[PDB]
Amino acid sequence: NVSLYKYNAVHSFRNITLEFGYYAPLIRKCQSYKKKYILYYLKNLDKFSDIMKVENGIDVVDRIGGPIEALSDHLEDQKKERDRRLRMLIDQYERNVMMANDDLEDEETSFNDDPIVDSD
Amino acid sequence: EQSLAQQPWVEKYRPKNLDEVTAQDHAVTVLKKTLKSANLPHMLFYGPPGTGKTSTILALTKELYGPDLMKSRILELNASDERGISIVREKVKNFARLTVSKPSKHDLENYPCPPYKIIILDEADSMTADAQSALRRTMETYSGVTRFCLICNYVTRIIDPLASRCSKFRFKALDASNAIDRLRFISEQENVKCDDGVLERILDISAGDLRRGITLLQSASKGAQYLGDGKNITSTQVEELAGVVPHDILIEIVEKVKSGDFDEIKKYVNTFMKSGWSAASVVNQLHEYYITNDNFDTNFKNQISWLLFTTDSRLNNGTNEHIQLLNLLVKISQL
Amino acid sequence: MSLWVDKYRPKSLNALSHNEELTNFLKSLSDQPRDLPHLLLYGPNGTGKKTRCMALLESIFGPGVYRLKIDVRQFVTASNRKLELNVVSSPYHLEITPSDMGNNDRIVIQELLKEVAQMEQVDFQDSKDGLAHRYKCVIINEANSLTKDAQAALRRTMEKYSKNIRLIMVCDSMSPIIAPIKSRCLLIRCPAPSDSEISTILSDVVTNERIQLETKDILKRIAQASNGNLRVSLLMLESMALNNELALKSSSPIIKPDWIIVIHKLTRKIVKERSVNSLIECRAVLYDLLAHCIPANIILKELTFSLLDVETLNTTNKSSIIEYSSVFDERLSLGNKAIFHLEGFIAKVMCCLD
Amino acid sequence: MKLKLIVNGCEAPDDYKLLRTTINTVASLRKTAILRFNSERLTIISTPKSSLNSSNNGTILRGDTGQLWCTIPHDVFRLYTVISARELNTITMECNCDSLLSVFKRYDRVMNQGSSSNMTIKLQSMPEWNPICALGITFEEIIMHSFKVPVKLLFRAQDTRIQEPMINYIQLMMYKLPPISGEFGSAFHGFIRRVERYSNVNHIHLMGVKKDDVELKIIVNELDWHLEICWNGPLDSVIDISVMVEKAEQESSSTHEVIIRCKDWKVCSKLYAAFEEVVLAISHDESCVFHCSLDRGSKPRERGQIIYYIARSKGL
Amino acid sequence: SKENLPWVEKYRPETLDEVYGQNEVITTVRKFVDEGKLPHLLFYGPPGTGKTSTIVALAREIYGKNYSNMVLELNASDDRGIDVVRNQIKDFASTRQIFSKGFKLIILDEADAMTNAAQNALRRVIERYTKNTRFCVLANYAHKLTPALLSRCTRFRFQPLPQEAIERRIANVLVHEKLKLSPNAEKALIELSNGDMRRVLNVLQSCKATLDNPDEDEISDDVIYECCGAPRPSDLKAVLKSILEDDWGTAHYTLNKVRSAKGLALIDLIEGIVKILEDYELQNEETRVHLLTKLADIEYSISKGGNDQIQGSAVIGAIKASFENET
Numbered sequence A: 001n002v003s004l005y006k007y008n009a010v011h012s013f014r015n016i017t018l019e020f021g022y023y024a025p026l027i028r029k030c031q032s033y034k035k036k037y038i039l040y041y042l043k044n045l046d047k048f049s050d051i052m053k054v055e056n057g058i059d060v061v062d063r064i065g066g067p068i069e070a071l072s073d074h075l076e077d078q079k080k081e082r083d084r085r086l087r088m089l090i091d092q093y094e095r096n097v098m099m100a101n102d103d104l105e106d107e108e109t110s111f112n113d114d115p116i117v118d119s120d
Numbered sequence B: 001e002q003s004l005a006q007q008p009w010v011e012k013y014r015p016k017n018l019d020e021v022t023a024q025d026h027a028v029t030v031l032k033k034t035l036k037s038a039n040l041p042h043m044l045f046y047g048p049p050g051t052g053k054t055s056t057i058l059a060l061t062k063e064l065y066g067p068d069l070m071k072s073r074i075l076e077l078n079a080s081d082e083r084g085i086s087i088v089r090e091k092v093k094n095f096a097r098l099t100v101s102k103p104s105k106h107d108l109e110n111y112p113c114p115p116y117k118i119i120i121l122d123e124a125d126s127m128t129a130d131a132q133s134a135l136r137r138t139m140e141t142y143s144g145v146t147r148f149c150l151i152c153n154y155v156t157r158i159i160d161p162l163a164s165r166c167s168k169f170r171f172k173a174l175d176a177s178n179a180i181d182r183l184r185f186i187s188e189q190e191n192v193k194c195d196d197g198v199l200e201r202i203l204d205i206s207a208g209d210l211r212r213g214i215t216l217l218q219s220a221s222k223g224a225q226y227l228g229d230g231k232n233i234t235s236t237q238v239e240e241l242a243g244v245v246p247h248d249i250l251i252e253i254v255e256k257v258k259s260g261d262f263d264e265i266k267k268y269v270n271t272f273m274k275s276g277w278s279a280a281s282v283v284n285q286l287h288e289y290y291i292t293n294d295n296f297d298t299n300f301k302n303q304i305s306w307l308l309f310t311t312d313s314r315l316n317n318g319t320n321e322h323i324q325l326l327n328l329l330v331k332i333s334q335l
Numbered sequence C: 001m002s003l004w005v006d007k008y009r010p011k012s013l014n015a016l017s018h019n020e021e022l023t024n025f026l027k028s029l030s031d032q033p034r035d036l037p038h039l040l041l042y043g044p045n046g047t048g049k050k051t052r053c054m055a056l057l058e059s060i061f062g063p064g065v066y067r068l069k070i071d072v073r074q075f076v077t078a079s080n081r082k083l084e085l086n087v088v089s090s091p092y093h094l095e096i097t098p099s100d101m102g103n104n105d106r107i108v109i110q111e112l113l114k115e116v117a118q119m120e121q122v123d124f125q126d127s128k129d130g131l132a133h134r135y136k137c138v139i140i141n142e143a144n145s146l147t148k149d150a151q152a153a154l155r156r157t158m159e160k161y162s163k164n165i166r167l168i169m170v171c172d173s174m175s176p177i178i179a180p181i182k183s184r185c186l187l188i189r190c191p192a193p194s195d196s197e198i199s200t201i202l203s204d205v206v207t208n209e210r211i212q213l214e215t216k217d218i219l220k221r222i223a224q225a226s227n228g229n230l231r232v233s234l235l236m237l238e239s240m241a242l243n244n245e246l247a248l249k250s251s252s253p254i255i256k257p258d259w260i261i262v263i264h265k266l267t268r269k270i271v272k273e274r275s276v277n278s279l280i281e282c283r284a285v286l287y288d289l290l291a292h293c294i295p296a297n298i299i300l301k302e303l304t305f306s307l308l309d310v311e312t313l314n315t316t317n318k319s320s321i322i323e324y325s326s327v328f329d330e331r332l333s334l335g336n337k338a339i340f341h342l343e344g345f346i347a348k349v350m351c352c353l354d
Numbered sequence D: 001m002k003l004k005l006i007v008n009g010c011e012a013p014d015d016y017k018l019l020r021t022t023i024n025t026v027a028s029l030r031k032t033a034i035l036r037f038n039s040e041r042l043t044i045i046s047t048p049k050s051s052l053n054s055s056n057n058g059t060i061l062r063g064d065t066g067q068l069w070c071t072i073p074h075d076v077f078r079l080y081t082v083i084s085a086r087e088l089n090t091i092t093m094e095c096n097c098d099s100l101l102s103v104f105k106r107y108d109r110v111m112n113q114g115s116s117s118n119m120t121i122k123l124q125s126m127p128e129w130n131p132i133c134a135l136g137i138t139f140e141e142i143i144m145h146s147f148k149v150p151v152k153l154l155f156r157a158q159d160t161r162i163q164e165p166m167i168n169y170i171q172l173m174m175y176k177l178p179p180i181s182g183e184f185g186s187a188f189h190g191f192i193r194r195v196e197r198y199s200n201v202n203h204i205h206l207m208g209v210k211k212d213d214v215e216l217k218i219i220v221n222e223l224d225w226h227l228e229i230c231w232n233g234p235l236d237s238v239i240d241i242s243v244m245v246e247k248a249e250q251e252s253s254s255t256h257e258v259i260i261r262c263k264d265w266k267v268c269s270k271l272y273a274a275f276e277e278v279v280l281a282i283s284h285d286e287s288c289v290f291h292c293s294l295d296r297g298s299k300p301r302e303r304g305q306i307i308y309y310i311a312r313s314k315g316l
Numbered sequence E: 001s002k003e004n005l006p007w008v009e010k011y012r013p014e015t016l017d018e019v020y021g022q023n024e025v026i027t028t029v030r031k032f033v034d035e036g037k038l039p040h041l042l043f044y045g046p047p048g049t050g051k052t053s054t055i056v057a058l059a060r061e062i063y064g065k066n067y068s069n070m071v072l073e074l075n076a077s078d079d080r081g082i083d084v085v086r087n088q089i090k091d092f093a094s095t096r097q098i099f100s101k102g103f104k105l106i107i108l109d110e111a112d113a114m115t116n117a118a119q120n121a122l123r124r125v126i127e128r129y130t131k132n133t134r135f136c137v138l139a140n141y142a143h144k145l146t147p148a149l150l151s152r153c154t155r156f157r158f159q160p161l162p163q164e165a166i167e168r169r170i171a172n173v174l175v176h177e178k179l180k181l182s183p184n185a186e187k188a189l190i191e192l193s194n195g196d197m198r199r200v201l202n203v204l205q206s207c208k209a210t211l212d213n214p215d216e217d218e219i220s221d222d223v224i225y226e227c228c229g230a231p232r233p234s235d236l237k238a239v240l241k242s243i244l245e246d247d248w249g250t251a252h253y254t255l256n257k258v259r260s261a262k263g264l265a266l267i268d269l270i271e272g273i274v275k276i277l278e279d280y281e282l283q284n285e286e287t288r289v290h291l292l293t294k295l296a297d298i299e300y301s302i303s304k305g306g307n308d309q310i311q312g313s314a315v316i317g318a319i320k321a322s323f324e325n326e327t
């Protein structure tokens, strides 16, 4: 749900069990750590503009199912948390459509050449 | 012309009448003369994929009744429909007991209109044993107004009482000997220019399935049209499209097997599975190469035939291709 | 931002950079899509089959095929067991994974797909006179994982309503596909990219991301560690770049899936010790792996080939190992609980080694 | 972009009722509606080809192909200030139907209370947020109630792609429905809504046969028994991969039939109840058009029109 | 009306005299009805041996032409759950005859498809109302019948139809039709029937169809094989001889040619070869073990599809390897 509603990416459950479930949380954890370090440096003081786009409460930075420790109503609460985060994702995505759409390329300069006028 | 070009070639060239069905005359003759005898029995069509069973039954139904009457005289059910025991006991029985609809004057003038309906149970082998048992006395009792047609690929999946009730029609495999005329006609209709023997190669590759052959011909024609060079289609292009392993790769595999080194065979198989070849095709090609070779003895051929049969049976169970292929090659290298 | 697996994903046939012959074949298919047959794409996982299907759809329809949204469809079983399925949709096509329904996948074929096949798609013509008709495109992910009943239900739906629907199924292996379904499809083999092409793609990504690379050899190593899985290659490239301050070096470790490392450790343990207690600990490891929803057959493959990679083992040991692997793979295919067969394989290997 | 409009319900209540029905229909049909303000009339569109509507993929998922078009002459509004540098001073926008419906419901409540104020509608540039603007709507309540609605302006290229469907008039059979206010109005209203008594019916087969000189029938064949509902009262007749749909051969030169969805029929019933002059046009095995016309004169004035196009749900 | 019927139904026996092959059972049941001491009956046998026909004919004889008014017939096509047994069967068995016409008859055709609970409920219904009602249970699979039900019924076994009865019925059908059957065709039909009359009648109808002019054309063995698409004995003999004497290449070519000549299927060839080998005199018994096991495995594999060429080569190799033991 997070991937679909934040990156327009659809992935299979099989690939999540095999590849994404381990790699994606690691990448997001590293990015979150880098963002925290950069923020701390700025407070104490564009190239990596894709790193500080990770949200603390919406992104997943933990291995799905926990670590594989082999050789080195919890379910209801997890479902409730999933529903809450899905609602937040839907709220975030709802305003995107009305905000703007890619549509096609037009004469935007001409549109700006006739600005709205409001006066009584 | 665009509307006529909206259909894949298999659906476009599906037989319209019984005359268009090819290579199945042994049953088509009986079905055709049923039009005059009006003595249609319960039927059990059985045979391998793409041999013309569904097409034959559809053509028969069209010929018997016509476009209008058919809608009131035909009940078709297949694997896409729910066919539980309750369905057999209620819906099928109710249709079988339904009074025979009155044909119009036009229908009587133009079509024989036999005084019975038809229930078609396509993919009958998917039905359960109990559901099949529920059909026995329904078919026997209402045979005066209803006739059943069961269709399947695996006849053993039909319970013995139903097989006894139905007159059996085996549909033969369509190969280069009996189905070449239809494929040549289709190629001529679509103006496909192919080298001599190309249709033979397609039919041999298809291995009894004319639907696969027609799809292959369409794919080759599309490739040639996109190329737009005006040249004839070649057998090499057909083999590439069909997924046949090139002869040089098979020769390399055979040399590796002859060498006998386990590590080398494992490495080569690991690299070979990269290309995504289907293990079934590779096994078939290996069988053809080894069984027909005159450089091996009788005991070798017996052992390899049993090994190939075991591997093919395991593959049929949806097993894991890399493991089965490596095991087969290791076993052969040990012969 | 988005993961590099999706960020630099090609969005058109002309953007494909490996397996040129496959691209040419797909373009030939897109020349006259009016009579496009049903398609079945098969090849190694993570090679770009879904990407190629989306590129083909874009060629037929346009970029709008990438404007995807998700809907939830509810199904009720004969036992009143309500459940749901995710359906992805673009204004021109649909995407479904019925295998996520387990044994209930057939219901999805019998209710949803059939309905989609039955509803003929027509629209008012903008300039011409009368309605215009267009067939719908449906993608079936993980086709090889469908039960035989669902595959049987697909047959007459594909045949009868060919005017309204065209199926594009994708699988990693055609062994589980019943013969009729293969007969009803145009089969397209999708080879995995070579190490050179994987390295080229990774180098393009590195240049785009402005990551300092000591030598190109690293990329090659990454390719050799992915076993041709481009998605895995990109994931490990991103992980390594992030873990090394966006500076890769020949000494930088290659990051592999954790379960793969666990299976390697299990193989080492099996080789070192062969006893009942060792078997019980192997059971514990196998159950830990299964708890993460790793498929049993995948575990069997990875364990088998990891064992075959051991240098100390002799020819007889490896031959017996592969024999047992084939037997227990068949048993898993025909079985109900995978633990029995995995344990049997490990016990047989322990017996043959000892 | 000045779009100054004044709406009063105490003068010419027919125009206010027409506008209310138009907004209700577009709200009940699709989530978003297109508004085209020309120098002569206002056109309200509910179509699946709009940028916002097409985001739902309705056509491929549920076959939402019907199109609603409504025309409102500028005389409806007391003040009509629409100035633009486009063709015929045309301004195109897309708006959400729920907010407009709520605002108009509040206005109706205020009017029913006893107020006789006027609604002023203007276009404004909200600093809070194809630039998105706001529709400033304000009115007095015997208290100056003001509400704003988001709106998205459209370009000429985007505007021109939304074209009203047309039909082959020569190959089209039209029937003049009895006026709802007439003695037969209740009978025809019940006849239209009869099929609603069958919950499990999804598609209805409309048929029209020559020989008051024609007759209309609704056929249902989804039940265990064949059902036909016939009207015996008076009824007068007015005298890429895309391919053309297949049309079944007509049974006779004087019979026209089409299969449509029940929801479209309910929409048609509501439209028929709303207006007085209603025409039902059938293009055999092609489509059904519901045309509601409102006539007003002074030098006859412009005729208010609501045209609902419904594509066939199944082939014949 | 009867002319339009399929032959399997058009030639259904009407009286007990028309039932052939089951002489002992027919004799006993006829004497029972003559003395009017009919007990509860079980008819056990394989498909198409005359069970349903026999029971219907017996009902006709007992009640004449009005048997439909005092006979309650139920089969697998009808729901026969415990509720049905408790209500419908119970009420029928516990009510008087229409005109005091002795006892009533309840026929439970294909009773092996009934649930265990219904069969258990049937026990006391059968026992208590024996004075007024008699039960008949027909089955092909006895293991589906509970021991209590089996104990309550007098058991009669319908054997596979002997050759003589099939010949007599074939002669009757040939006379009824305007058909001519050759002795070789009759032998082939009897061989392929396997004791089932339904197969005989269906194949005869198809053969009549195959004839261009049935009024004068005679059915030969070739017509029978064409209609059934079955191998000829000469084909089986040639294939077996090539397998047992010729080299691998020659055997493969012979099998391919024989199959391609008439589009023969491998399963029928295997079945015919098994029939041939069952009579072979083998000095080594291990050969029989190998033959049986390998051929059964091949048959099971064929039942699921697979590769036809590989299966044929497997048959060849299995026979060769098995017969290497006799060496």
Ligand SMILES: Nc1ncnc2c1ncn2[C@@H]1O[C@H](COP(=O)(O)OP(=O)(O)OP(O)(O)=S)[C@@H](O)[C@H]1O
Binding pocket: B009, B010, B011, B013, B014, B015, B020, B021, B022, B023, B024, B047, B048, B049, B050, B051, B052, B053, B054, B055, B056, B152, B153, B182, B210, B211, B214, C155, C179, C180, C183
């Ligand atoms: N005997 C045939 N004659 C002509 N065309 C055939 C024949 N058999 C198959 N085809 C072609 O292949 C297509 C499929 O034929 P089908 O009748 O559906 O085969 P089938 O035996 O019903 O396949 P299965 O058992 O459902 S996998 C037809 O539309 C034809 O174009």
Ligand SMILES: Nc1ncnc2c1ncn2[C@@H]1O[C@H](COP(=O)(O)OP(=O)(O)OP(O)(O)=S)[C@@H](O)[C@H]1O
Binding pocket: B160, B161, B164, E007, E008, E009, E011, E012, E013, E018, E019, E020, E021, E022, E045, E046, E047, E048, E049, E050, E051, E052, E053, E054, E139, E140, E169, E197, E198, E201
């Ligand atoms: N003994 C028989 N004598 C003459 N015809 C027979 C005989 N048995 C079977 N038939 C013929 O085959 C048809 C079927 O006979 P049935 O009595 O229904 O066989 P059945 O034993 O009841 O089959 P099952 O067990 O229900 S599959 C009859 O209409 C007859 O034409």
Ligand SMILES: Nc1nc2c(ncn2[C@@H]2O[C@H](COP(=O)(O)OP(=O)(O)O)[C@@H](O)[C@H]2O)c(=O)[nH]1
Binding pocket: C004, C005, C006, C008, C009, C010, C015, C016, C017, C018, C044, C045, C046, C047, C048, C049, C050, C051, C052, C201, C230, C231, C234
């Ligand atoms: N630059 C480039 N990337 C590709 C190409 N083909 C696939 N990819 C990328 O590599 C990944 C392949 O994974 P995927 O599309 O899911 O393949 P599948 O699992 O076999 O269907 C994707 O992230 C693609 O973006 C290609 O031809 N060129």
Ligand SMILES: [Mg+2]
Binding pocket: B053, B054, B055
């Ligand atoms: Mg078929």
Ligand SMILES: [Mg+2]
Binding pocket: E051, E052, E053, E109, E138
């Ligand atoms: Mg019987």
